Amino acid sequence: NEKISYRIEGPFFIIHLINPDNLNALEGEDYIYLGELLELADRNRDVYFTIIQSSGRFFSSGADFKETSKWVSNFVARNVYVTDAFIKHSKVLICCLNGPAIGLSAALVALCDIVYSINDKVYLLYPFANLGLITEGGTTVSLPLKFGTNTTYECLMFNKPFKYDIMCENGFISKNFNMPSSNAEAFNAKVLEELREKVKGLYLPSCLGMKKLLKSNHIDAFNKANSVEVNESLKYWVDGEPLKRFRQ
Amino acid sequence: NEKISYRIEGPFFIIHLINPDNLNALEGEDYIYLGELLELADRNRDVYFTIIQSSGRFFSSGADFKETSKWVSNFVARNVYVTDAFIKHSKVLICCLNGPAIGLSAALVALCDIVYSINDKVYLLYPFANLGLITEGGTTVSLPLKFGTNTTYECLMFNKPFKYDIMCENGFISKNFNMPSSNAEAFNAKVLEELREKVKGLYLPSCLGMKKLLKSNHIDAFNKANSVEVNESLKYWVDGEPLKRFRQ
Amino acid sequence: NEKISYRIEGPFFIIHLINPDNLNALEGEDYIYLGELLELADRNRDVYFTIIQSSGRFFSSGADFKETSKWVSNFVARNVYVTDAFIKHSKVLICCLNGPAIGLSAALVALCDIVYSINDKVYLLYPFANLGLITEGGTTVSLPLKFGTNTTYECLMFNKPFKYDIMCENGFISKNFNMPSSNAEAFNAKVLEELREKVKGLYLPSCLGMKKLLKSNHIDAFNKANSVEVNESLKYWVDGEPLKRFRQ
Amino acid sequence: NEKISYRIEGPFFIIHLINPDNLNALEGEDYIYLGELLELADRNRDVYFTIIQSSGRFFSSGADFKETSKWVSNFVARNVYVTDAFIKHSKVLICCLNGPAIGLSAALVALCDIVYSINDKVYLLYPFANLGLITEGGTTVSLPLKFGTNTTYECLMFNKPFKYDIMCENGFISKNFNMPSSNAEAFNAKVLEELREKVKGLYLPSCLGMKKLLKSNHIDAFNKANSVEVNESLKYWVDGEPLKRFRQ
Amino acid sequence: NEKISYRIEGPFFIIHLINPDNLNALEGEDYIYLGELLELADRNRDVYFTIIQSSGRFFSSGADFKETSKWVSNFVARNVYVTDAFIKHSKVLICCLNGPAIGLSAALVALCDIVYSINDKVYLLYPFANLGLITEGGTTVSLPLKFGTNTTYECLMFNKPFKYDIMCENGFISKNFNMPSSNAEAFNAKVLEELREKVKGLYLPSCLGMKKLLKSNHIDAFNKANSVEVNESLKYWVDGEPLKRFRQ
Amino acid sequence: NEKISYRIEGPFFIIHLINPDNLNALEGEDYIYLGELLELADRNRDVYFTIIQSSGRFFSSGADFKETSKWVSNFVARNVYVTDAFIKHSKVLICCLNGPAIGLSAALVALCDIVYSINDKVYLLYPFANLGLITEGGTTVSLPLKFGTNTTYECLMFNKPFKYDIMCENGFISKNFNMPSSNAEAFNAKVLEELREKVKGLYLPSCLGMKKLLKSNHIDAFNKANSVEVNESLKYWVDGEPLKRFRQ
Numbered sequence A, B, C, D, E, F: 001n002e003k004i005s006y007r008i009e010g011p012f013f014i015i016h017l018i019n020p021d022n023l024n025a026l027e028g029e030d031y032i033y034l035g036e037l038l039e040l041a042d043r044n045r046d047v048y049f050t051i052i053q054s055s056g057r058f059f060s061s062g063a064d065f066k067e068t069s070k071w072v073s074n075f076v077a078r079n080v081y082v083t084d085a086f087i088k089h090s091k092v093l094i095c096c097l098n099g100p101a102i103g104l105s106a107a108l109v110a111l112c113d114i115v116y117s118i119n120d121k122v123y124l125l126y127p128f129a130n131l132g133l134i135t136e137g138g139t140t141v142s143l144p145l146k147f148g149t150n151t152t153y154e155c156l157m158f159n160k161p162f163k164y165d166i167m168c169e170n171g172f173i174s175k176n177f178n179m180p181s182s183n184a185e186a187f188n189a190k191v192l193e194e195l196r197e198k199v200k201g202l203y204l205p206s207c208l209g210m211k212k213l214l215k216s217n218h219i220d221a222f223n224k225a226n227s228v229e230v231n232e233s234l235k236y237w238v239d240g241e242p243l244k245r246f247r248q
Helices: A028-043 A072-088 A104-109 A139-147 A149-157 A164-169 A184-198 A204-215 A219-239 A241-246 B028-043 B072-088 B104-109 B139-147 B149-157 B164-169 B184-199 B204-215 B219-239 B241-246 C028-043 C072-088 C104-109 C139-147 C149-157 C164-169 C184-199 C204-215 C219-239 C241-246 D028-043 D072-088 D104-109 D139-147 D149-157 D164-169 D184-198 D204-215 D219-239 D241-246 E028-043 E072-088 E104-109 E139-147 E149-157 E164-169 E184-198 E204-215 E219-239 E241-246 F028-043 F072-088 F104-109 F139-147 F149-157 F164-169 F184-199 F204-215 F219-239 F241-246
Strands: A004-009 A012-017 A049-053 A092-097 A114-117 A123-125 B004-009 B012-017 B049-053 B092-097 B114-117 B123-125 C004-009 C012-017 C049-053 C092-097 C114-117 C123-125 D004-009 D012-017 D049-053 D092-097 D114-117 D123-125 E004-009 E012-017 E049-053 E092-097 E114-117 E123-125 F004-009 F012-017 F049-053 F092-097 F114-117 F123-125
Touching: A004 A028, A012 A028, A012 A184, A028 A049, A028 A072, A049 A184, A072 A104, A072 A219, A092 A104, A092 A184, A092 A204, A104 A123, A114 A164, A114 C149, A139 A149, A139 A219, A139 B204, A139 C149, A149 B114, A149 B139, A149 B204, A204 C139, A204 C149, A204 C219, A219 A241, A219 B204, A219 E219, B004 B028, B012 B028, B012 B184, B028 B049, B028 B072, B049 B184, B072 B104, B072 B219, B092 B104, B092 B184, B092 B204, B104 B123, B114 B164, B139 B149, B139 B219, B139 C204, B149 C114, B149 C139, B149 C204, B219 B241, B219 C204, B219 D219, C004 C028, C012 C028, C012 C184, C028 C049, C028 C072, C049 C184, C072 C104, C072 C219, C092 C104, C092 C184, C092 C204, C104 C123, C114 C164, C139 C149, C139 C219, C219 C241, C219 F219, D004 D028, D012 D028, D012 D184, D028 D049, D028 D072, D049 D184, D072 D104, D072 D219, D092 D104, D092 D184, D092 D204, D104 D123, D114 D164, D114 F149, D139 D149, D139 D219, D139 E204, D139 F149, D149 E114, D149 E139, D149 E204, D204 F139, D204 F149, D204 F219, D219 D241, D219 E204, E004 E028, E012 E028, E012 E184, E028 E049, E028 E072, E049 E184, E072 E104, E072 E219, E092 E104, E092 E184, E092 E204, E104 E123, E114 E164, E139 E149, E139 E219, E139 F204, E149 F114, E149 F139, E149 F204, E219 E241, E219 F204, F004 F028, F012 F028, F012 F184, F028 F049, F028 F072, F049 F184, F072 F104, F072 F219, F092 F104, F092 F184, F092 F204, F104 F123, F114 F164, F139 F149, F139 F219, F219 F241
Parallel strands: A012 A049, A049 A092, A092 A114, B012 B049, B049 B092, B092 B114, C012 C049, C049 C092, C092 C114, D012 D049, D049 D092, D092 D114, E012 E049, E049 E092, E092 E114, F012 F049, F049 F092, F092 F114
Antiparallel strands: A004 A012, B004 B012, C004 C012, D004 D012, E004 E012, F004 F012
């Protein structure tokens, strides 16, 4: 994979989206590859934190679109697989949001444990109602969990973004670094610099043990949502609305 | 019914409380009639949104009070029936709060998916402790859900209002229109004007499909709360405190 | 017990931590004694509210540390017993936070129904990662419940405090009294003065009936967390990290 | 109460239905009194077993029937109260079935932990379909639990008895004493004689501790069934079929 | 449809498999049609019982088998749809087993409320292990429910039939009519004759109300099993074993 | 380990208790070793079935008994560990019961998927009430599951065996081989001979996939029971009754 790299640095397994010209739009194979990277981090006994970083002005613009058209099975299969990988990951997942995230990639940002923002222009957009689709990526559970049920209905029902002010009002962002959007590279490195200082002295297996207990609060709900989001969308695909709108 | 009207406008089924002289206080039969209206909206395949609007300076002052006194069975039966109608409604429920809401009618505002406020003087009051009663209308679940558990205890235990500032601090209000309280009529129409613009372009069945999945997060808890609130209150009624206080 | 007193005043059972020179650090026996006091309040049919108050500049600095070293069984047994007492208490629990609370005593502050703060310097610290331990005191559930899941991960994973600003942003504090930290005594009395005015007129059994229904939302999760936090920590103790760090 | 006596004998609290001329038919007040007896046994720290015994040829023929007709509230309230008493009882409940049991009293036989039969003519009958009613006494859960789901549908749907052969095929009866039906008195005493021999040597608190864990398998289902059976029947009563049939 | 007829007779909606030459083997469209018939019975306010009857010596031999081979999606979609129809049916489902039932059709026999057998040669066979498949039709839940967990493992793991003796030992069969296998027609009519006599006198809405409460014991488990059986099989199909074995 | 051997034969991982002179009584270390063997079988991708076989006239007489007396922690820790290993095992567990099994080893027989008996003299005994203890090994759930709730109370409350006739009446035994008790060796080999014939032709991964779905019916209940049995017993140990009785 050329759009995504990774490396390990002490207890940190770092994943980097490096396709800024295309606003880190991702195809099915990029979402599989992201899931396999989380599997590799999850099985590395030296890794304690899995940091997701991107590049350019967008974190990611979401799915990249270019009866063989039954090609929606590999689409649906790639969404489930990468969602399930984020849900079950046992290492502390940290998103460095260097700009907006849209669709599935915004769904994965909502599954990370901790989120840092480059500046106040970040936003998350879930345009399901505009694509003739329904919740995906576990957002049925993660959005009301992290932004509250009334705010989630306003955004999802009317295809409106979860903006910075909403994200701060809910504690979704742990720290805003207030850096220009023209340098994700420097924001990425300053998050890693603060992280290296904050882990000093700590017993790192305690982070994983607390995460394991923390995750048991909503883990069944998340696995259930992953399966019913997919079950429920099938008729939307059979009707064909998404296909038309996806041709746009 | 003379206190409540309704009409349909494209995908919007609009319900209007139109008894401003009495601060849209409602009797048992008005709460049944409200439940039947939601049933009619729920079965209309053209309706996607059910908008609740009122009139005057109050959204509603709550229940209107004027062994045949075993008249508390029709009271308890009307609360359950209208709560159950809000809980199971499948269309997007939107409250236009044109002023304060008290009691059962404040419980129903907390069951809507989205809430807009006329101005910063709105408040929700649940004076159960002052009437010798306990939670009703599903507020056992909806209040800690939408306002947080510590804030819910402060308000409920001490008969204190959930005011505007608390509502905004929790994202309970999606938009404050900042209009005078002397014209609910203009606020009602401006909410409908914004709604007509926000649905343009959207695939409306996607709104209902996301709501169906969203509602499965807490639907069992809500149905359970509706039944145990009623079970639990019966001894309060047998003791007779509410009867005395309701005579006041 | 010399470090903790109690008294009853109308419907209020008042518990007072009175060891300000040692920052109300508590040993195992002080945590048992606190649990027994809650049992006494819980069985007193005249008590409706259980108020916890402290003294000095700290609410409490947490556990006081001075194969008989299998002394961690009485440690683990005292944490479970006092957590279980806070979880199942049927009277309205109110914490008067006169300064910071750390560890188990910060876990118990998060189990109270209502919390008042002396001033904006209060904070809650859970330094599990720094002691080679994991969540305790039901904080697996109470922290994400009251502060949100992303904020809880930032604080717990990196041994960072839940400060005043975070507490207000989540409605954790019902009222800040903005008094100097040199007089907890006057803050304690002004909370009791406001409480005596707010209960006037109310039907006090309604407070307990609403609390009983309110508590059934998360009571199983809390009991489960109390048991799995303890189950899960045992290997941390068998490995011996906490023992070393506790020697510091 | 003249129809029911009780006594304590070592670890055994013995309850005896002593109205053989009327086939131990019970009224609402007899079912309350039975519930209060179980409360007395449950709070006696010397009792470990609660033995229910009757007299004559029937264990019990069920409910004794002789807008004040809203007399069905005390009916429904007495069924719930005595069912809830059997469900939550913490001592080992043992039924000595000296003949057939019908209706609510057959529902209570199905809530005992252990059942002995006088001879092969015993049967349990639940004639809900013949009275225009639905399951009661927790039989929604206890019948499929103890007799299997297909057999429960045959009996309940067609108002057919659960006979001895069905009871033995499911292990419902621990021992048949094969005594004439003209002497319940001797069967009652021989059950007590065997019981006194079987408890010898045993650690009696172990019986209660195993029962507490055993009961947590279905206790929520039983409490839920008690509440929804009652909720669901209300419309049957509002329609008036049972009233007519109960006049027969 | 030529392989399946139906008719209504008082409160009985009768469905009849009438393809004895082919041992009432069914294709996908026959399983859809069976589901639609149950929908028609379920919405008929005069029907209280839905009786399933067949013809000839077999009740049914199961699925009839004669990248377009992605034809397994319509296969999987037809199994889910007809299972879901049996699970949610609100009328009393009664199977008249006139001979053996194999596969999906044996799964549907295990979802009926009541089962009558023509004679002791009936058996149910679930040859999942022999087709490279896993449980289907809700048999993950219905088999351990109705035959016990150890017996279910013996049969399923080793592709062995649930025979008559096993069915009687578990109360799966309510009545064996002991008629020759050369006349299903007479057995069908004698079941209907007994049914007409057993409903006399009964309040038929009481049958449906008891079924509604009875079904809430395992309805979530059944819906869950229907969805995870399908989710889990997909990799068996991707591997291709079933395809090979289905070519046999 | 000298008391237990194992070997692999095609898809069968065979475990053999080979201490007939001591009636295959087991110590803590033998129960750990049994758990580790199940781990080895569980991770072997060639094994599909885990067969447990013993020797002599008893399958096993249970635990072998010969403040350091706080030796009950290693006792309790060994019971949990080996129970958890049986609960989570993913391969088909088959017990060859060559005679009676008592205590923990009888608890493990009740956790196997399939059980074969040498002859009609086998029995299972759980003498918790006679040792001043409570349910262990997951028997809180497995006994009512496999023998029914009333029969379980008779046996457990009165320290009476689950005998062959009770085992057959519940389908607990899939096949009785009716061989003398003086040759377990020949019974062991004839079970393996039948097993080798029954797996022929089958798709072996289908056995594991059906087991995975089958086990999700009660797996949470089993894990919960393992943890609360242990939590609940601790006070029995603190009181000291078991210690006294274990000295006997």
